[PDB]
Design a protein around this ligand. Structure first.
Ligand SMILES: CCOc1cc(N2CCC(O)CC2)ccc1Nc1ncc2c(n1)N(C)c1ccccc1C(=O)N2C
Length: 338
């Protein structure tokens, strides 16, 4: 690490393919933060593009249920030697994966409040025309006061070919799996369904071992998909596999989750569907009786203007992307002078 005399590192808390997250605190004030070192940020084209996407998306959003950038450290060395980017972020106590899968409490009210906040965050996000495409419990961060923030926007796109490799298997929407040529904000609401069902039972809803077994377990609850959907499948082998299986009626959610709440299973049923148009939106989900306790439309804003993904469609070299990223770091600091 290399954060200067402004911050103070404590302990490493997270690590992925393109990020080393660590807790810290600012010395002038004392408040706790998360610093995320992106090492060798400009060495690979895909990694540089993800980095510039996250910076622009997180700079666009200002919402209590979306991770915010608190600061981006400027280059300490001259430009040519600037290899590692440091991003200062909201520090959060844990994530929902850890919360669900532990000896911690998770009563119905926990699920209701967590779900409300996720959906509150998605309403704002979706109004900006941004699909997250990778919502899972481990990307839903939770703080000491039970506030839930959505994080990791590197997979996020707006409104390609190999769609079945978008996201993680267990939370991947059918339309991506089967390539149904209708990819919208609806993708996220499938994932929210899986998250919701996971909180109710404290185990994964559709834990598939492989591509085919993922389709099995989904069809064991939802039943066999309709002929309209079946014909919409692009690959010959998948369509052939579904048609070989016998017809199956949908199992009621009241039987899938026996002891669970009646109003919860109602809203779950509106999320977990084969047809993406058949799924309830985030905005309509907030209007459901299950979330009546927390719902207030004056406290649930949209995002305006929407997010432009045109920058990501450009064919830029590693250096041009480094220039683009450095421009954002400059723009961030220039925006905080008024
Ligand atoms: C005070 C330490 O709190 C934590 C403990 C654990 N652990 C202890 C280790 C156990 O094995 C597992 C749970 C995990 C996370 C946090 N907090 C935290 N806050 C903020 C972020 C973050 N994590 N990372 C890693 C993210 C993860 C997913 C998506 C986004 C982020 C992100 O961008 N930020 C800034």
């Amino acid at each position: 690490f290399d954060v200067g005399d402004e911050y103070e590192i404590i302990e490493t808390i997270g690590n992925g393919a393109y990020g080393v997250v660590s807790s810290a605190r600012r010395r002038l004030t004392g408040q706790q933060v998360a610093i995320k070192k992106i090492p060798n940020a400009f060495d690979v084209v895909t990694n540089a593009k993800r980095t510039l996407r996250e910076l622009k998306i997180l700079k666009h959003f200002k919402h209590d249920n979306i991770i915010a950038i608190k600061d981006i450290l400027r280059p300490t060395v001259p430009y040519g030697e600037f290899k590692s980017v440091y991003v200062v972020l909201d520090l959060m106590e844990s994530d929902l994966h850890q919360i669900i899968h532990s000896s911690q409490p998770l009563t119905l009210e926990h699920v209701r409040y967590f779900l409300y906040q996720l959906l509150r965050g998605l309403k704002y996000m979706h109004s900006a025309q941004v699909i997250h495409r990778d919502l899972k419990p481990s990307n839903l961060l939770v703080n000491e006061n039970c506030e839930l923030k959505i994080g990791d926007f590197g997979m996020a796109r707006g409104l390609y070919f190999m769609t079945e490799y978008v996201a993680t298997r267990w939370y991947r929407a059918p339309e991506l799996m089967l390539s149904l040529h209708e990819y919208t904000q609806a993708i996220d609401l499938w994932s929210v369904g899986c998250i919701f069902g996971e909180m109710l039972a404290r185990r994964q809803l559709f834990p598939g071992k492989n591509y085919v077994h993922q389709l099995q377990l989904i069809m064991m609850v939802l039943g066999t998909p309709s002929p309209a959907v079946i014909q919409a499948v692009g690959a010959e082998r998948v369509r052939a596999y579904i048609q070989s299986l016998p017809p199956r009626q949908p199992v009621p959610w009241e039987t899938v989750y026996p002891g669970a709440d009646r109003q919860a299973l109602s809203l779950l049923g509106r999320m977990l569907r084969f047809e993406p148009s058949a799924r309830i939106s985030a905005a309509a989900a907030l209007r459901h009786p299950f979330l009546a306790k927390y719902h207030d439309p004056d406290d649930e804003p949209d995002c305006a203007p929407p997010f432009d993904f045109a920058f990501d469609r450009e064919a830029l070299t590693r250096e041009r992307i480094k220039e683009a990223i450095v421009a954002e770091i400059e723009d961030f600091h220039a925006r905080r002078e008024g």
